[PDB]
């Protein structure tokens, strides 16, 4: 392959390296622990920075200086030895260290599960005793020599133990003679009867301990004989004395060593093929623990068998050295140098290796040499991963050092810190301010910042206008800011878009492309209608300006990422250019209608005419500037430029009233006429009161039917009118405008009496401590509701606090209830309710204890908001890597499978009541089947977008279920087709053939988190969503049924006992350990005994695990279950997410199948493989003799799905980089670079959007007619 790495790539094949690869990579052999001469500051020879080994530090100069130009290149100076070349080969040239003793690699030993352990069938607890020189290991044994000198050496053993017994009856005879001397000197004199036999007890105790001596050494000899009989390879001889005696008496017949060279000898003497087939035979016949361990070893054994990898590289003989510029020793200004913390580890390895080499050369005893080899092993282990095994090797200040494994792991490795997210040039940031005079596609830009962004552009341009002699005078002219540079700067800015990042970029609209314009000041002026997409209030938020350069980049910014082209959501298609907040209030006051206002239409006659008609809105505006007409009075104008509503159009004109000439009268207000002049000519008259939902529906209709530029101009006009009438609306806040409810004291007394009676009944022992708390909680909830109700009925409509709320601008009604009235119940730090409760509004001012109670809930909510965010961003991070490979490849899969939609379920009396969640579950979908009813005609044919009018047509015709396509059953190979994905929710049209819909899906799911509280043992929020996507077993596990029938209900000891009575029958499924802390499932009534359950009826109440409903009710029902169960949470927070995003994620969950039977082809049982590979393998192996591998569908969580991907590069860059990297290195798993993070990493063009070859290889020529006319 390419060594200087020109951009031609097809693969990226990792592999376990060998010593003949390592000493072929190198250009030298570093053999001294020196870096730089202390006095001349030049690198040492044969050190860690030697210019002979690693290349010159100076461009085209040798070390002795005898060659100093380009004309001497490629050659080597015959004295210094330094190859004269360019001085960036020190970035790339490597070196190696020839070790004096072999050393095991740490990743294949220490990280669980251990790979040397599974390869050799050794325990890690006992393998650590081998490679750290703590225990011996037998690496070979002679068979037939033991087979006959077993007899000869047991004869010798009998001779030895008979000589032992010669010594032992010498002991017996000698103490027998001394004991008869004890007789002849104890019973021959005058003495005491017990003191004459204390010497009798003495010599007998001597023989007891002496036969203990002889017995223990005979047991030692028996032990060493049993060990020599049962000696075998892969055995461990602990107890040094036994090994030494065993060697020097039985020094033939076996070889046995200690440490990494012995492990290397075992890897030399190891048939992988017969070992592998023995494991195949064990999984062919075994059971239980043996079969599970046989699978877990067959994994790595067949991994080393299938590839061309010898497993000899797991021990290591030559260690390579990273180039000097990657571990650079840079000096700061002032001689305080900066080493790179790898230099010390290499110095430790070089020192210990040279010390080992001199010890072996000098001749040293075995203790010193094995201590030195253990030190060498620990040095290499610290080099590859410091902190892995034992104490991390510290530096000064007790700071653990940074080894090679710590350059990749975690957030500060190369992957998450420098491969994916880079600091970029042509950039800048500032604080933002509101820009209410800008157009939608414009933005502010401070000129003192633009002059530094566009500095090469303005440099070229004011060279071109002869304002500078050359480039250098132009640069100095820029740096002094001579005032014609601003006039040049306008020309270089105009029509050249910039990007506006805002961290944290939660979803796709965090980066948009605006046309810049110059603004006095130093703060970026942002247009106000993108605050909702950016989630940008003006509390001091800051936004980053980028700058696209190339023609492709400017076209992408101008066409894809422009502001006015991205109005709607990506998620639910509602507008985000919708005028919110202030603007909305303004429009509300502009279209509201006041009865009894100045200048109404009254038809009163007899004395005077009606005085309400106005011939034109021009006359109406003149009568409004004079103080006659209010803006909000009901009059009868005669319009000629506005399209009447559908009933009046069909009345006055029937079929074709074209509006620019026609005239028609209407009783409206003047405000609604001025409002409808903002909307375009084709749009009908509205004549309502501009609630925020009404404006959302208007902009959704106007975006679904008109082109985009009309939508942008209409939204801009609504912004201008909304601000201008928001100033006039008079919405102020004064404490005279916060009215208190007059009946409040009576309400508080009436509930205070009930609180007093509950407290009295607790004091008289009629109920315990918890039930009185529950009674008080319910009473004060009732009090809160009554105070809020009286407050709601007390206010007028033109009270500005209730006007802001009931317009829909901002704020719910509970905030008005807490401004005036009652705060209510305030929570505990644990989560319960404080039973006091707070009875003062914030207008009246709280007391000390009430405020101290409120602080609990406030700080709890704020800290919970912080932690959730971290969790919501992390969930998004996981989901992006899960669905990074769902990109739209084909126009049409052309299947016929597809899901059904509930779609306005049946009324009991019998109508078509509309299902409320249709917009998330039915719209923007393409039918696979047709709509037919009562053997009638077709209604909606195959493959239609199925928007609002055709849903209205289906509900008019009277059907309830349509079979529609989905991205669950798109039958394309790699990612979905287009027509299964349906309408792209951002465009309004059909999805393109380059979209990365997995990323849009992941961002729209984990985008609106944050704000997703919890509740008052089912998990009910963001951790519930997370355990759904992780496919966990839930906390409140409620088991589901397995077959129909009546139930065998029983309340056992302190918890339940439920069993299903079968109907064929068969074996009864027994559910024993169901807690009484749970509840039984209620439906339609509670679960009663003898009731007939379904096949997968949920028995108890809580959360069903998706594994069990997969195993019982298959893939379809677990898809329905997951979608319903996630959308239940998001509807509980009231967040519109369309289901196809969740379907994109669930389709990534249900890819793989498991292997319960190998068939006879390549598939290990329990392993998880992709479904398409499984089917293609069965299609290959039905020929050449037919056997099926048996497959079952699995539902796996999203971590394991992301880590068991095909490309090792993405799975290394995601998480668990060490283990992913080491088993990819074992499997020799070649990447194909076909994914989506990999092309981001290696810098080439990603295969989505404008990167795919359907758009990247467009030939663009001038047409021949205009060519001839040119």
């Amino acid at each position: 392959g390419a060594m200087l790495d020109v951009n031609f790539f097809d693969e990226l094949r990792i592999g376990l390296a060998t010593a003949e690869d390592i000493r072929q990579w190198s250009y030298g052999e570093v053999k001294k622990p020196e870096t730089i001469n202390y006095r001349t500051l030049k690198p040492e020879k044969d050190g860690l920075f030697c210019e002979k080994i690693f290349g010159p530090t100076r461009d085209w100069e040798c070390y002795c200086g005898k060659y100093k130009r380009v004309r001497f290149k490629g050659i080597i100076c015959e004295r210094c030895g330094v190859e004269v070349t360019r001085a960036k080969v020190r970035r790339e040239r490597m070196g190696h260290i020839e070790l004096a003793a072999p050393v095991t690699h740490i990743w294949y030993f220490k990280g669980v599960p251990s790979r040397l352990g599974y390869l050799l069938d050794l325990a890690p607890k006992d393998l650590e005793k081998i490679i750290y020189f703590a225990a011996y290991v037998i690496t070979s044994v002679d068979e037939e020599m033991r087979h006959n000198e077993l007899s000869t050496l047991e004869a010798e053993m009998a001779v030895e133990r008979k000589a032992v017994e010669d010594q032992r009856d010498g002991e017996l005879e000698a103490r027998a003679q001394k004991l008869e001397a004890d007789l002849a000197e104890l019973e021959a004199e005058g003495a005491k009867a017990d003191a004459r036999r204390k010497v009798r007890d003495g010599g007998e105790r001597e023989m007891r301990q002496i036969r203990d001596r002889a017995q223990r050494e005979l047991d030692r000899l028996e032990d060493i004989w049993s060990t020599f009989t049962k000696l075998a390879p892969k055995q461990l001889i602990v107890d040094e004395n036994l090994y030494r005696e065993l060697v020097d008496r039985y020094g033939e017949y076996f070889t046995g060593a200690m440490g990494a060279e012995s492990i290397q000898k075992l890897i030399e003497n190891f048939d992988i093929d017969a070992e592998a087939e023995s494991l195949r035979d064990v999984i062919r016949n075994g059971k239980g623990q043996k079969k599970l361990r046989a699978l877990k070893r067959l994994k790595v054994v067949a991994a080393f068998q299938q590839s061309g990898n010898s497993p000899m590289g797991m021990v290591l003989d030559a260690v390579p050295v990273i180039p000097p510029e990657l571990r650079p020793m840079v000096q700061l200004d002032g001689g305080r140098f900066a080493t790179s913390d790898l230099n010390d580890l290499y110095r430790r390895v070089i020192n210990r290796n040279n010390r080992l080499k001199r010890l072996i050369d000098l001749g040293a005893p075995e203790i010193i040499v094995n201590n030195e080899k253990r030190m060498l092993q620990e040095s290499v282990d610290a080099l590859f991963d410091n902190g892995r095994r034992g104490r991390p090797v510290t530096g000064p200040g007790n700071r653990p050092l940074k080894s090679l494994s710590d350059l990749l792991k975690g957030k500060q490795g190369r992957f998450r810190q420098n491969l994916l997210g880079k600091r970029v040039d042509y950039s800048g940031r500032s604080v933002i301010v509101v820009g209410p005079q800008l157009k939608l596609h414009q933005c502010g830009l401070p000129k003192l910042m633009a002059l530094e962004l566009f500095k090469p552009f303005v440099m070229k341009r004011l060279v071109d206008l002869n304002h500078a002699q050359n480039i250098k005078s132009a640069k100095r002219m820029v740096e002094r800011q001579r005032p014609q540079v601003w006039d040049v700067l306008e020309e270089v800015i105009a029509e050249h878009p910039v990007l506006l990042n805002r961290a944290p970029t939660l979803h796709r609209l965090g980066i948009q492309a605006f046309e810049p314009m110059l603004v006095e000041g130093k703060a970026i002026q942002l247009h106000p209608l993108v605050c909702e997409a950016f989630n940008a209030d003006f509390d001091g938020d800051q936004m980053a300006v980028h700058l696209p350069l190339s023609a492709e980049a400017q076209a992408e910014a101008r066409i894809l990422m422009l502001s006015s082209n991205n109005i709607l959501s990506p998620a639910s298609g509602r507008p985000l250019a919708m005028p919110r907040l202030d603007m909305v209030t303004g429009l509300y006051y502009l279209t509201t209608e006041v009865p009894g206002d100045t200048g109404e239409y009254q038809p009163a006659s007899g004395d005077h005419p009606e005085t309400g008609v106005y011939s034109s809105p021009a006359e109406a505006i003149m009568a409004a500037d004079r103080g006659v007409l209010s803006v909000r009075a009901k009059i009868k104008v005669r319009l000629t430029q506005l399209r009447p509503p559908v009933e009046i159009e069909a009345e006055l004109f029937g079929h074709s009233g074209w509006q620019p000439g026609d005239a028609w009268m209407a009783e409206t207000t003047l405000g609604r006429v001025m409002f409808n002049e903002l909307l375009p000519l084709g749009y009908p008259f509205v004549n309502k009161q501009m609630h925020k939902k009404v404006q959302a529906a208007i902009i959704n209709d106007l975006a679904e039917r008109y082109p985009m530029i009309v939508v942008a101009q209409t939204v801009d006009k609504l912004k201008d009118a909304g601000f201008y009438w928001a100033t006039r609306s008079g919405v102020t806040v004064s404490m005279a405008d916060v009215l208190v409810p007059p009946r409040k004291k009576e309400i508080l007394d009436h509930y205070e009496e009930r609180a007093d009676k509950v407290e009295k009944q607790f004091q008289r022992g009629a109920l315990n401590h918890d039930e009185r708390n529950e009674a008080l909680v319910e009473i004060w909830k009732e009090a809160t509701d009554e105070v809020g109700q009286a407050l709601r009925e007390h206010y007028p409509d033109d009270n500005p606090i209730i006007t802001i709320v009931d317009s829909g601008a901002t704020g719910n009604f509970t905030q008005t209830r807490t401004l005036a009235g009652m705060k209510g119940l305030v929570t505990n730090p644990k989560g319960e309710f404080i039973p006091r409760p707070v009875k003062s509004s914030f207008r009246e001012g709280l007391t000390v204890l009430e405020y101290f109670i409120n602080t609990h809930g406030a700080r709890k909510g704020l800290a919970d908001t912080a932690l959730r965010t971290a969790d919501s961003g992390y969930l998004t991070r996981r989901l992006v890597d899960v669905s990074q490979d769902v990109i739209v490849r084909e126009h049409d899969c052309q299947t016929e499978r597809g899901i059904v939609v509930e779609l306005a379920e049946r009324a009991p009396d019998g109508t078509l009541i509309r299902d409320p969640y249709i917009e998330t579950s039915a719209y923007a979908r393409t039918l696979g089947t047709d709509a037919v009813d009562e053997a009638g005609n077709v209604i909606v044919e195959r493959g239609q977008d199925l928007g609002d009018p055709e849903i209205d047509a289906l509900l008019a015709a009277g059907i309830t279920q349509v079979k529609v396509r989905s991205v669950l059953t798109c039958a394309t190979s790699t990612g979905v087709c287009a027509t299964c994905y349906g309408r792209s929710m951002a465009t309004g049209k059909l999805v393109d053939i380059g979209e990365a819909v997995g990323i849009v899906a992941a961002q729209s799911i984990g985008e609106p988190g944050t704000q997703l509280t919890m509740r008052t043992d089912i998990t009910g929020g963001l951790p519930r969503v997370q355990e759904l996507f992780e496919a966990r077993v839930p906390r409140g596990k409620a088991p589901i049924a397995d077959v129909t029938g009546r139930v065998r209900l029983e309340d056992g000891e302190r918890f339940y006992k439920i069993t299903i009575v079968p109907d064929d029958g068969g074996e009864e499924v027994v559910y024993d350990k169901i807690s009484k802390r749970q509840r039984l499932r209620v439906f339609k009534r509670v679960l009663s005994d003898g009731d007939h359950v379904e096949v997968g009826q949920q028995l108890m109440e809580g959360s069903a695990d998706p594994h069990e409903v997969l195993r019982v009710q298959g893939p379809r029902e677990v898809q329905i279950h997951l979608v319903r169960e996630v959308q239940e949470v998001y509807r509980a927070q009231g967040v519109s997410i369309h289901d196809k995003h969740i379907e994109v994620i669930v389709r990534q969950m249900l890819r793989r199948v498991t292997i319960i039977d190998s068939g006879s082809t390549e598939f290990l049982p329990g392993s998880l493989i992709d479904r398409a590979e499984f089917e293609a393998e069965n299609r290959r192996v039905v020929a050449e003799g037919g056997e099926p591998a048996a497959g079952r569908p699995v539902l796996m969580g999203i971590t394991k799905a992301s880590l068991a991907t095909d490309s090792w590069l993405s799975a290394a860059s995601f998480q668990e980089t060490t283990r992913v990297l080491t088993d990819a290195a074992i499997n020799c798993r070649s990447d194909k670079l076909n994914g989506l993070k990999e092309n981001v990493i290696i810098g080439k063009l990603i295969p989505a959007g404008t990167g795919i070859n359907r758009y990247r290889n467009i030939a663009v020529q001038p047409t021949e007619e205009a060519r001839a006319a040119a």
Partner: protein
């Protein structure tokens, strides 16, 4: 205080990266003891050394059979040197006889 900025200990020059002509140069072949071949491009007018530390790292001689007789140096100092410079031959021979008759009187009695 200042600043931060730092430099690698070395200069970065920039000239024409021309490739059409260079200084013409030879190719010599050195050989280790264990059959390894290495090619080293020396310049033309350059006294080519007889031995050369190769890419492998062990000392390699040239493939031309001249063998200029490098006259390899003495062994530095041995335990025999540190013993002989503080004792004498008749004393060491006396001790040799003492251990000789010691293993004799041990063995045959």
């Amino acid at each position: 205080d200042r600043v931060l900025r730092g430099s690698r200990l070395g200069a970065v020059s920039y000239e024409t990266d021309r490739n059409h002509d260079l200084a013409p140069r030879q190719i010599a072949r050195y050989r280790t003891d264990n059959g390894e071949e290495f090619e080293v491009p020396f310049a033309d007018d350059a006294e080519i050394p007889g031995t050369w530390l190769c890419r492998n790292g062990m000392e390699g001689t040239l493939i031309e059979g001249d063998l200029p007789e490098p006259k390899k140096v003495k062994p530095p100092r041995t335990h025999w040197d540190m013993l002989l410079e503080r004792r004498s031959i008749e004393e060491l021979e006396e001790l040799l006889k003492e251990r000789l008759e010691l293993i004799r009187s041990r063995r045959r009695g």
